[PDB]
mmCIF file of C-alpha atoms in Angstrom:
data_model
loop_
_atom_site.group_PDB
_atom_site.id
_atom_site.type_symbol
_atom_site.label_atom_id
_atom_site.label_comp_id
_atom_site.label_asym_id
_atom_site.label_seq_id
_atom_site.Cartn_x
_atom_site.Cartn_y
_atom_site.Cartn_z
ATOM 1 C CA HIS A 29 -0.084 -0.014 -0.499
ATOM 2 C CA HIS A 30 1.836 3.375 -1.310
ATOM 3 C CA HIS A 31 -0.865 5.435 0.159
ATOM 4 C CA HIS A 32 -1.955 6.144 4.064
ATOM 5 C CA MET A 33 -5.063 3.894 5.395
ATOM 6 C CA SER A 34 -7.575 5.040 7.903
ATOM 7 C CA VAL A 35 -9.130 2.832 9.927
ATOM 8 C CA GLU A 36 -12.632 1.810 9.051
ATOM 9 C CA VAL A 37 -15.924 0.233 10.611
ATOM 10 C CA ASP A 38 -15.611 -3.483 8.835
ATOM 11 C CA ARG A 39 -12.491 -3.043 8.165
ATOM 12 C CA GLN A 40 -8.370 -4.498 9.536
ATOM 13 C CA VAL A 41 -7.084 -2.114 11.617
ATOM 14 C CA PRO A 42 -3.275 -1.140 10.477
ATOM 15 C CA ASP A 43 -0.277 -3.096 12.724
ATOM 16 C CA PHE A 44 1.142 -0.150 15.067
ATOM 17 C CA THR A 45 3.642 -0.402 17.134
ATOM 18 C CA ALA A 46 4.034 2.887 20.780
ATOM 19 C CA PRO A 47 5.458 3.615 23.508
ATOM 20 C CA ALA A 48 3.343 3.257 26.734
ATOM 21 C CA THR A 49 4.115 2.691 30.029
ATOM 22 C CA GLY A 50 5.739 -0.575 30.600
ATOM 23 C CA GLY A 51 6.739 -0.780 27.607
ATOM 24 C CA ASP A 52 5.882 -0.697 24.288
ATOM 25 C CA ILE A 53 3.052 -1.880 23.210
ATOM 26 C CA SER A 54 2.066 -4.078 19.065
ATOM 27 C CA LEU A 55 -1.540 -4.108 18.032
ATOM 28 C CA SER A 56 -0.108 -7.719 17.416
ATOM 29 C CA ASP A 57 -0.190 -8.559 20.784
ATOM 30 C CA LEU A 58 -3.457 -8.130 21.280
ATOM 31 C CA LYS A 59 -4.171 -10.721 18.673
ATOM 32 C CA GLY A 60 -7.085 -13.060 20.734
ATOM 33 C CA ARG A 61 -7.829 -10.479 22.613
ATOM 34 C CA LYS A 62 -10.484 -7.683 22.421
ATOM 35 C CA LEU A 63 -8.908 -4.098 22.365
ATOM 36 C CA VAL A 64 -10.539 -1.256 23.167
ATOM 37 C CA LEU A 65 -8.793 1.588 22.689
ATOM 38 C CA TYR A 66 -9.763 5.073 23.814
ATOM 39 C CA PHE A 67 -8.374 8.060 23.196
ATOM 40 C CA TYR A 68 -8.710 11.035 25.658
ATOM 41 C CA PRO A 69 -7.598 14.739 24.941
ATOM 42 C CA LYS A 70 -4.933 15.444 28.118
ATOM 43 C CA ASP A 71 -3.595 13.869 31.552
ATOM 44 C CA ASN A 72 -4.364 14.927 34.305
ATOM 45 C CA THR A 73 -7.966 17.659 33.602
ATOM 46 C CA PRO A 74 -11.183 16.372 35.134
ATOM 47 C CA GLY A 75 -12.782 14.864 32.064
ATOM 48 C CA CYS A 76 -10.157 12.742 31.050
ATOM 49 C CA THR A 77 -9.313 11.133 35.200
ATOM 50 C CA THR A 78 -12.702 10.337 34.995
ATOM 51 C CA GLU A 79 -12.532 8.629 32.146
ATOM 52 C CA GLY A 80 -9.567 6.783 33.587
ATOM 53 C CA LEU A 81 -11.288 5.956 36.948
ATOM 54 C CA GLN A 82 -14.587 4.839 35.164
ATOM 55 C CA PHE A 83 -12.271 2.549 33.342
ATOM 56 C CA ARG A 84 -10.567 1.130 35.747
ATOM 57 C CA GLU A 85 -13.711 0.511 37.994
ATOM 58 C CA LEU A 86 -15.049 -1.940 35.623
ATOM 59 C CA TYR A 87 -11.863 -3.210 34.072
ATOM 60 C CA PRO A 88 -12.637 -7.343 36.061
ATOM 61 C CA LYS A 89 -15.482 -6.859 33.998
ATOM 62 C CA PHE A 90 -13.803 -6.195 30.422
ATOM 63 C CA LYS A 91 -10.744 -9.031 31.287
ATOM 64 C CA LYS A 92 -13.679 -11.271 32.195
ATOM 65 C CA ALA A 93 -15.141 -10.461 28.803
ATOM 66 C CA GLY A 94 -11.967 -11.095 26.918
ATOM 67 C CA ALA A 95 -10.808 -7.827 26.069
ATOM 68 C CA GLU A 96 -7.673 -5.097 27.095
ATOM 69 C CA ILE A 97 -8.056 -1.569 27.610
ATOM 70 C CA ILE A 98 -5.973 1.184 26.302
ATOM 71 C CA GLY A 99 -5.316 4.861 27.351
ATOM 72 C CA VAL A 100 -4.187 6.841 24.484
ATOM 73 C CA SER A 101 -3.571 10.935 24.492
ATOM 74 C CA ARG A 102 -0.047 12.876 22.612
ATOM 75 C CA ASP A 103 1.564 13.041 26.833
ATOM 76 C CA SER A 104 4.626 12.051 27.592
ATOM 77 C CA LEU A 105 5.905 8.763 29.344
ATOM 78 C CA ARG A 106 6.219 10.643 32.253
ATOM 79 C CA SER A 107 3.745 12.375 32.424
ATOM 80 C CA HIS A 108 1.906 9.066 31.709
ATOM 81 C CA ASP A 109 3.783 6.838 34.458
ATOM 82 C CA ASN A 110 2.822 9.426 36.950
ATOM 83 C CA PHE A 111 -0.963 9.684 35.470
ATOM 84 C CA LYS A 112 -1.201 6.082 35.849
ATOM 85 C CA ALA A 113 0.066 5.854 39.804
ATOM 86 C CA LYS A 114 -2.172 8.966 40.580
ATOM 87 C CA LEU A 115 -5.611 6.873 39.516
ATOM 88 C CA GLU A 116 -4.133 3.449 40.281
ATOM 89 C CA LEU A 117 -4.845 3.014 36.650
ATOM 90 C CA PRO A 118 -4.108 -0.937 36.428
ATOM 91 C CA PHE A 119 -4.374 -1.189 32.496
ATOM 92 C CA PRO A 120 -1.941 1.120 29.952
ATOM 93 C CA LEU A 121 -1.347 4.281 28.288
ATOM 94 C CA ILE A 122 0.111 4.483 25.192
ATOM 95 C CA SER A 123 1.908 8.263 24.315
ATOM 96 C CA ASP A 124 1.192 9.381 20.940
ATOM 97 C CA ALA A 125 3.462 12.103 21.805
ATOM 98 C CA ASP A 126 4.330 11.887 17.575
ATOM 99 C CA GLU A 127 0.524 11.306 17.114
ATOM 100 C CA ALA A 128 0.995 8.705 14.713
ATOM 101 C CA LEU A 129 -1.644 7.101 16.304
ATOM 102 C CA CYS A 130 -4.141 9.699 16.235
ATOM 103 C CA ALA A 131 -3.195 10.199 12.626
ATOM 104 C CA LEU A 132 -4.438 6.269 11.780
ATOM 105 C CA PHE A 133 -7.436 6.728 13.746
ATOM 106 C CA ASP A 134 -8.043 9.968 12.440
ATOM 107 C CA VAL A 135 -8.591 12.500 16.194
ATOM 108 C CA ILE A 136 -7.360 15.049 15.637
ATOM 109 C CA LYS A 137 -9.445 18.439 15.665
ATOM 110 C CA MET A 138 -8.547 21.959 15.650
ATOM 111 C CA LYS A 139 -10.061 24.464 17.835
ATOM 112 C CA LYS A 140 -10.134 28.122 17.064
ATOM 113 C CA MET A 141 -9.537 30.303 20.540
ATOM 114 C CA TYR A 142 -9.019 33.722 20.080
ATOM 115 C CA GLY A 143 -8.028 33.833 16.776
ATOM 116 C CA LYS A 144 -5.043 30.934 16.970
ATOM 117 C CA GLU A 145 -6.036 27.664 16.382
ATOM 118 C CA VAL A 146 -4.704 24.702 18.766
ATOM 119 C CA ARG A 147 -4.148 21.123 17.871
ATOM 120 C CA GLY A 148 -6.024 19.280 19.878
ATOM 121 C CA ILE A 149 -7.646 14.974 20.371
ATOM 122 C CA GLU A 150 -11.125 14.260 20.159
ATOM 123 C CA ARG A 151 -12.019 12.477 22.809
ATOM 124 C CA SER A 152 -13.046 8.914 20.817
ATOM 125 C CA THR A 153 -13.391 5.156 21.586
ATOM 126 C CA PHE A 154 -12.308 2.345 19.320
ATOM 127 C CA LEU A 155 -13.560 -1.324 19.744
ATOM 128 C CA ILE A 156 -11.491 -4.214 18.299
ATOM 129 C CA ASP A 157 -12.059 -7.355 18.077
ATOM 130 C CA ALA A 158 -9.610 -10.796 19.018
ATOM 131 C CA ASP A 159 -9.293 -11.145 14.723
ATOM 132 C CA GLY A 160 -7.811 -7.291 14.956
ATOM 133 C CA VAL A 161 -11.405 -5.733 13.006
ATOM 134 C CA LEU A 162 -12.767 -2.304 14.264
ATOM 135 C CA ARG A 163 -16.373 -2.779 15.304
ATOM 136 C CA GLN A 164 -17.474 -0.132 16.342
ATOM 137 C CA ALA A 165 -15.955 4.011 16.862
ATOM 138 C CA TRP A 166 -17.248 6.802 18.853
ATOM 139 C CA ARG A 167 -16.088 9.264 18.082
ATOM 140 C CA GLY A 168 -16.425 13.015 20.270
ATOM 141 C CA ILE A 169 -18.505 11.214 22.991
ATOM 142 C CA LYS A 170 -18.999 12.803 26.437
ATOM 143 C CA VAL A 171 -18.148 10.854 29.628
ATOM 144 C CA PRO A 172 -21.163 9.980 31.065
ATOM 145 C CA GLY A 173 -22.210 6.506 30.389
ATOM 146 C CA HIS A 174 -19.359 5.616 28.069
ATOM 147 C CA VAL A 175 -17.755 3.272 29.701
ATOM 148 C CA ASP A 176 -20.900 1.688 30.237
ATOM 149 C CA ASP A 177 -21.926 1.647 26.763
ATOM 150 C CA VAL A 178 -18.456 0.305 25.814
ATOM 151 C CA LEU A 179 -18.407 -2.272 28.181
ATOM 152 C CA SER A 180 -21.725 -3.283 26.803
ATOM 153 C CA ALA A 181 -20.080 -3.633 23.597
ATOM 154 C CA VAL A 182 -17.720 -5.709 24.681
ATOM 155 C CA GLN A 183 -20.186 -8.092 25.803
ATOM 156 C CA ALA A 184 -22.049 -8.596 22.962
ATOM 157 C CA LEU A 185 -19.100 -9.508 20.819
#
């Protein structure tokens, strides 16, 4: 493939590798498990803290249903180590500082602040099955109710 391929529901997710808490993660590491890959704008903000804590609270149910959780933001590994420790998260955080995954999943959104454009992440989640296929996307979602919805989708696959 001589052109970049972005993710689409019903289609294979292109294989990727990225730095993470505890060491690097490749999509191929997740073969045979469901993967909830959740993108959040920024470590240590209120909404991203609540989202992480709610995935933490339901983590045993995700695991029982055959799924892993991975959070993604562009923050540094140092920030991720601190944020994971503060929230006692039982799952990894990918540091997408170079935007490879944000580009692949098409979550970048420019925001206008006082005549300046700011490069942001649109809070979005992707459910990838054990076969590596994108089964469901939630783009620009609000946090309340979201982890419940993702767990229901994981359980129904």
